Amino acid sequence: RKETYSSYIYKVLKQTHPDTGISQKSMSILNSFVNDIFERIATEASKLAAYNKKSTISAREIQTAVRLILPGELAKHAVSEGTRAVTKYSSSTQAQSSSARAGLQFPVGRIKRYLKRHATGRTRVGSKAAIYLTAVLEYLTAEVLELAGNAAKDLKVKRITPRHLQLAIRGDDELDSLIRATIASGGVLPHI
Amino acid sequence: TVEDSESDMDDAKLDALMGNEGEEEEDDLAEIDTSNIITSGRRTRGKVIDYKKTAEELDKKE
């Protein structure tokens, strides 16, 4: 529980929708996803990189993973937004504020830390990475919440619950075959 | 707790003090291609009328 991306999400929670107090666990599943998808990528990247000796986790390392991780369609936009991001992000220069230049108010330093402490493998984390991870998260993180957010409120309650996720997750076959994280609360699809 | 949080800002450095390849300019700026068709991270659309009916009309037709 510690702190999780509660705060920043809370900012992507009010922004994505003003009526979204979000269910704690829905904040755990997303957080677990956001945390698990953060690993799935940074894991394979750190994998094809630990074996390639590349060590320098660059956009190309996470891109491939993203491409091998995400079914593809999601990737297509995950790499499109991630690229255009390094551009506007680097267009100026790291001389203003990464937590504002990256164009993503998502934990740029804390995640960059998840790459330093978790990888701790001579991972310099060139600007060609930390951002690709904050870009793909705000993309799918804001997406999962956008579907269930605008739907959970148009369906019955602003306080979404693992159920609206049962659909937003088990509904989108692609994500499902990609998230399959837990849904141990609303995933009332198999046993009744 | 907080006192000047707001993005913190004083984080990406204290941690990326590693120096960072600095190739920031050569980050990538090229792979762009499907950015003129697929779009998101701003206002996706789907709703996904629950009732499970969509969980099937989708888990089969989609």
UniProtKB/Swiss-Prot annotation, chain A:
Any single GO BP term: regulation of DNA-templated transcription
Record localization: Nucleus; Chromosome
Main location: nucleus
UniProt PTM: Acetylated by ESA1, a component of the NuA4 histone acetyltransferase (HAT) complex, and/or by GCN5, a component of the SAGA complex, to form H2A.ZK3Ac, H2A.ZK8Ac, H2A.ZK10Ac and H2A.ZK14Ac once deposited into chromatin. Acetylation is required for function at telomeres. H2A.ZK14Ac is acetylated at the promoters of active genes.
Keywords of the record: Acetylation, Activator, Chromatin regulator, Chromosome, DNA-binding, Nucleosome core, Nucleus, Transcription, Transcription regulation
UniProt KW Transcription regulation keyword: yes
Molecular function GO terms recorded: chromatin binding; chromatin DNA binding; identical protein binding; protein heterodimerization activity; RNA polymerase II cis-regulatory region sequence-specific DNA binding; structural constituent of chromatin
Residue segments, region Interaction with VPS72: 171-181
Keyword Nucleus annotated: yes
Annotated Gene Ontology cellular component terms: chromatin; euchromatin; nucleosome; nucleus
Description of how the protein assembles with itself and partners: The nucleosome is a histone octamer containing two molecules each of H2A, H2B, H3 and H4 assembled in one H3-H4 heterotetramer and two H2A-H2B heterodimers. The octamer wraps approximately 147 bp of DNA. H2A or its variant H2A.Z forms a heterodimer with H2B. H2A.Z associates with the VPS72/SWC2 subunit of the SWR1 chromatin remodeling complex. Also interacts with RBP1/DNA-directed RNA polymerase II largest subunit. Interacts with NAP1. Interacts with MPS3.
Note: Present with 2840 molecules/cell in log phase SD medium. In contrast to H2A1 and H2A2, appears to be weakly or not sumoylated.
Family the entry assigns: Belongs to the histone H2A family.
Function: Variant histone H2A which can replace H2A in some nucleosomes. Nucleosomes wrap and compact DNA into chromatin, limiting DNA accessibility to the cellular machineries which require DNA as a template. Histones thereby play a central role in transcription regulation, DNA repair, DNA replication and chromosomal stability. DNA accessibility is regulated via a complex set of post-translational modifications of histones, also called histone code, and nucleosome remodeling.
Protein name: Histone H2A.Z
Organism: Saccharomyces cerevisiae (strain ATCC 204508 / S288c)
UniProtKB/Swiss-Prot annotation, chain B:
UniProt source species: Saccharomyces cerevisiae (strain ATCC 204508 / S288c)
UniProt GO MF annotations: histone binding
Record PTM Phosphoserine, positions in chain: 5, 7
More about this protein: Present with 623 molecules/cell in log phase SD medium.
Single GO biological process annotation from the record: chromatin remodeling
Domain of life: Eukaryota
The protein's name in its UniProt record: Histone H2A.Z-specific chaperone CHZ1
Cell compartment(s), UniProt: Nucleus
Subunit structure: Forms a heterotrimer with H2A.Z-H2B, stabilizing the association of the histone dimer. Also, with a lower affinity, forms a heterotrimer with H2A-H2B.
Family, similarity comment: Belongs to the CHZ1 family.
Keyword Membrane listed: no
Annotated spans, Important for H2A.Z-H2B binding: 24-45
Keyword Iron among UniProt keywords: no
Comp. bias regions, Acidic residues: 21-31
